[PDB]
């Protein structure tokens, strides 16, 4: 159960929660910080959830 | 030469099955010992060809 | 700011939060003088943004 | 009107910007760029 | 070299979806489709 819960927790990082991409590094290299904070916000909500 | 007649029978073809064919590395990104499931076009097993 | 371009980036920019607000009005009554109102200049290059 | 459409790192890329490539060093904890992909990590030879 | 293209002027509208002017000269491109056509003055907003 612990491994199963831990593993599905890891796989959640592969879901972008409606953002452009599921990886932060690409988003920063792909968009301006006054234009990408409206996308990274969605990630830090779902990931926090 | 265009609407000529060939030397074919009247097409009684079989419907044999391969039981394992149609996997073609759907993505070029390398993966090792991964059970990743993808949604893409494939040739199902036991298919009648 | 929030809609970047070239002219504003060339000469004068504002912080992202941009508290307060801006008002723009036409001056063609006086500014568009026939003699040529050449006194208005701006910096194209200053080695960095 | 000209419309530019393209995709990011979906396949081996062939069009790149004016970025000038630098030499690569292994066994050193450095930032790495590869056709756009970035991050921080050590680079090592892999026999896989 | 998207830098010189952005350094040019007289753009009726210039909006980038998922990218930015400065990041254009950073990431590599799989391929592009530089579609070209022409419309009248009011039809520019009908794009996007």
All chains having 3 or more CB pairs closer than 8 angstroms to chain A: C, D, E
d(CA D36, nearest CA chain A) in Å: 7
Distances (CA, A) of E14 to C49, D1, E43, E45: 19, 11, 15, 12
Q: What letter does residue D37 receive in the DSSP assignment?
A: B
Segment (H or E) for D40? strand D40-41
Q: CB E9 to CB C6 under 8 A? A: yes
Nearest to D6 by CA among E23, A37, B39: E23
The CA R_g of chain E, rounded to the nearest whole Å, is: 13
Task: Name the residue in chain E with its Cα closest to that of C4.
Answer: E21
Using alpha carbons, select from A37, A34, A39 the residue that is nearest to residue A20: A39
- The coordinates were experimentally obtained by cryo-EM
Q: How far is B37 from chain D (nearest CA, A)?
A: 18
Q: Which two tokens stand for residue C11?
A: 């000469």
Between strands D30-31 and D40-41, the pairing is: antiparallel
Distance of residue D33 Cα from the nearest chain A Cα, in angstroms: 10
Resolution to 1 decimal place, in Å: 3.9
CA-CA distance, D25 to D45, in Å (whole number)? 11
CA E20/CA C12 separation, integer angstroms: 20
Nearest CA in chain D to E12: D1
Q: What does the alpha-carbon distance between residue B31 and residue D38 come to, in Å, rounded to a whole number?
A: 20
A20 to chain E: which residues are within 8 Å by CB? 18
């Amino acid at each position: 159960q612990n491994a199963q819960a831990l593993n599905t927790l890891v796989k959640q990082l592969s879901s972008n929660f409606g953002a452009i991409s599921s990886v932060l590094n690409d988003i920063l290299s792909r968009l301006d910080p006054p234009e990408a904070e409206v996308q990274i916000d969605r990630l830090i909500t779902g990931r926090l959830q | 030469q265009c609407v000529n007649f060939t030397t074919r029978t009247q097409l009684p073809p079989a419907y044999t099955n391969s039981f394992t064919r149609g996997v073609y590395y759907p993505d070029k990104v390398f993966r090792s010992s991964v059970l990743h499931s993808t949604q893409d076009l494939f040739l199902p097993f036991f298919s009648n060809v | 700011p929030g809609q970047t371009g070239n002219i504003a980036d060339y000469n004068y920019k504002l912080p992202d939060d941009f508290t307060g607000c801006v008002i723009a009005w036409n001056s063609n009554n006086l500014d568009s003088k026939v003699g040529g109102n050449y006194n208005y200049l701006y910096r194209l290059f200053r080695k960095s943004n | 009107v000209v419309v530019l459409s393209f995709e990011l790192l979906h396949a081996p890329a062939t069009v790149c910007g004016p970025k000038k490539s630098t030499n690569l060093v292994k066994n050193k904890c450095v930032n790495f760029n590869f056709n756009g992909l970035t991050g921080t990590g050590v680079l090592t030879e892999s026999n896989k | 070299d998207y830098s010189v293209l952005y350094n040019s002027a007289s753009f009726s509208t210039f909006k980038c979806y998922g990218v930015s002017p400065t990041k254009l000269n950073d990431l590599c491109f799989t391929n592009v489709y530089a579609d070209s056509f022409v419309i009248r003055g009011d039809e520019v907003r009908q794009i996007a």
